Amino acid sequence: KPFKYQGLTILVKKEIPRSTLDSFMQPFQSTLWLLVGLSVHVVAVMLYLLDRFSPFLTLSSAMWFSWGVLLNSGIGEGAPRSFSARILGMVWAGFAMIIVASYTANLAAFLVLDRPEERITGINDPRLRNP
Amino acid sequence: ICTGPNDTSPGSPRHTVPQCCYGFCIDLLIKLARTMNFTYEVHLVADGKFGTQERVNNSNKKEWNGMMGELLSGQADMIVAPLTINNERAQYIEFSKPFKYQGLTILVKKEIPRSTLDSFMQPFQSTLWLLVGLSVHVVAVMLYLLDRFSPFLTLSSAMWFSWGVLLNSGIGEGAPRSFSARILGMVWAGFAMIIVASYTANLAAFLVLDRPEERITGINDPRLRNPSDKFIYATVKQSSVDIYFRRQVELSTMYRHMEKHNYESAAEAIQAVRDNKLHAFIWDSAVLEFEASQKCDLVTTGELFFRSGFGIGMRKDSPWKQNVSLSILKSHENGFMEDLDKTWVRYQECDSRSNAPATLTFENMAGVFMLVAGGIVAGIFLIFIEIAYKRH
Amino acid sequence: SNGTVSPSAFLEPFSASVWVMMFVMLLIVSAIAVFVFEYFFTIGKAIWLLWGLVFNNSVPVQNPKGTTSKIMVSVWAFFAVIFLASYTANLAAFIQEEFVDQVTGLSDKKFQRPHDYSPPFRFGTVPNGSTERNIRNNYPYMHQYMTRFNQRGVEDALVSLKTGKLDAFIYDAAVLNYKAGRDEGCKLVTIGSGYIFATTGYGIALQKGSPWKRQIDLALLQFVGDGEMEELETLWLTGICHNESSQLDIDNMAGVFYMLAAAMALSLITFIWEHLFYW
């Protein structure tokens, strides 16, 4: 009579997550990073360019405002004074919110680079069925 | 012009009255009549059964009903109908090459998401909502007490700070002065962040109800393999599907759940599924997908099983076999049949079928619009309250 | 195909009716409210505060001083955080790389008219088969266009289509389904998610008036009814890609960049408008 009931099964090596120094930068492509970085600066410059020539917000104030609203920090307590500057700044803040939400929605997914490629679904799995 | 029974209800006088018929089978028949020189005379069936080998009460003799009952008796000699090809029917009468390749499928209710006003508050329980509503006030009050009795932030300012911390508003202006309060404010802010993160985490599932049971998976669905008294599914009595389910060796058990709910016709079963009387309907894929496209609240599941074809039934000893076979196949090879599918079966009124998550609409968060309207109508009264307070 | 993402994909989470109702009507009602509650702080400052509060990004604003206005702002901010959580709950799934079919079907104008395109569309079939007969008897011109793109066999056609030598391969359905299932990397797919034109089947050939026709027909029908065909096809004809974490490019974020470009354009237009107004 048997003294131990068991069966055939598959052993595989656990691919331990190896996190690179750029993993958090994986969700956004490098070209997108450069483009958004240039967009931050161009928005920052156009805000005070529009504000200074308003008959009705300096360099540092405008750039701090742009960077803070992009990062949700509140570093610069300087709001634009002209109307079209108000609309431009609020759209800039909305775009910042959208982009940071998109980054959040996939940051943790790319922070851990684990995929079920090494997982084996018994003997009916294809990679074992097909040599 | 088709002469058929007037009333389909059982136990009613059935008199042959001529109605007018038109459809895929009808214009397929006219295609045959144009390609092959012959005259036709279409008439309906004495009953609403496709055909099933049945025992008669006297002498226990086998007989066929419906199409093949009429055909073997000489009343009719050729059939244009969605007649499935199977072993049992092919033994006595002969079928041409299929004019529609299709399998078997399950039709169920779409079960549109239930929308309620209190959907957004579902994530947290009512007790937890009340407890956090008390917690914001109590944290505000001992912040006020700590700052007021400092060794070295008024009540209203304390409440504004607490509320603007709990929900991101910026209303609270002025950090606590005393060091004792400046740590409790920080930990209360951490608690508020935990609360808002927990609310954000899974409010989407509560806003739009999921489909734990609606997601049927072929015949392998647990409530299909093992039928209970709560989930009732049936099909057309005395048809191809009944014979198929009677033939399998593993499914016999659910066939015993199947025999006591069979409907007389496909339309009746479809209507029963429509008004939440029949949970699921087993039928051929073509009719079910056409109904799902047309009836917008009905949905197919997939995982086709028992793939077969609709064929032209005819007598075992007839000379039209080869002619109709070549004619129907020639209709296959040229542009005729896909044109017929485009004209009669290939048209959608709604689809709403995609793998993407559902698009949020009015009813999905009507609750938050009602909440902001209630906030407006509450403010329009608290203003008179505060004017009276300032009067005092 | 590589595929693309529609620029309006990030507006898809909420219907346009919801967007216009909340962001025009409800927003202005709340703003004019808070203004008149403060009266009992320009309306522009009010709408600015509401806009900044809808999507909190530490935007500098001037908070109202009234108690009732503060209650109004708090309830609006609760509404706004609900909106943000709902919008970002399924934003990742909505912004997904969808794969569009370049050919709608066998009747597509690309097949009908291959010359009127900058690239000559490269598509053909293996000769000596029923496919060429159907193509000839249905479409002679497109068959004589086939003649210069004929492939030696199925494996040659597959290896040519993997590279840029060919664009489409037309042949009977079962073989292509098996190849697509057994394809490595799932880089080859049939058009129309299983579009079938001839919708014919495979049969057993017999001599004219053969006595074996009846027995063979009964045997095949019995096998079909008993369900053997199911495990026979899932043991041989089954596939791998059947029943089966991506970076974001400029094309994925094309809509929001278009939105900001339109914002810059309208800001310039408003700049001109206010210069003429003050002039």
Author numbering:
A (entry chain A): 531 to 586, 601 to 675
B (entry chain C): 435 to 586, 601 to 840
C (entry chain B): 540 to 579, 599 to 802, 808 to 842
Reproduce passages from the article.
Canonical N-methyl-d-aspartate receptors (NMDARs) are glutamate-gated glycine-dependent ion channels abundant in the central nervous system. Their activation results in excitatory currents that underlie synaptic plasticity, cognitive integration, and memory formation. Each heterodimer consists of an obligatory GluN1 subunit plus a homologous GluN2 or GluN3 subunit, such that functional receptors comprise two GluN1 and two GluN2/3 subunits.
Presumably, the reduced likelihood of receptors being open in nanodiscs or detergent micelles is a consequence of the absence of a bona fide membrane bilayer. In contrast, in our open structure, all four M3 helices are bent by 19° to 25°, and the larger pore diameter at T3 (5.1 Å) is consistent with ion permeation. Only when all four M3 helices adopt a bent conformation does the receptor transition to the stable open conformation.
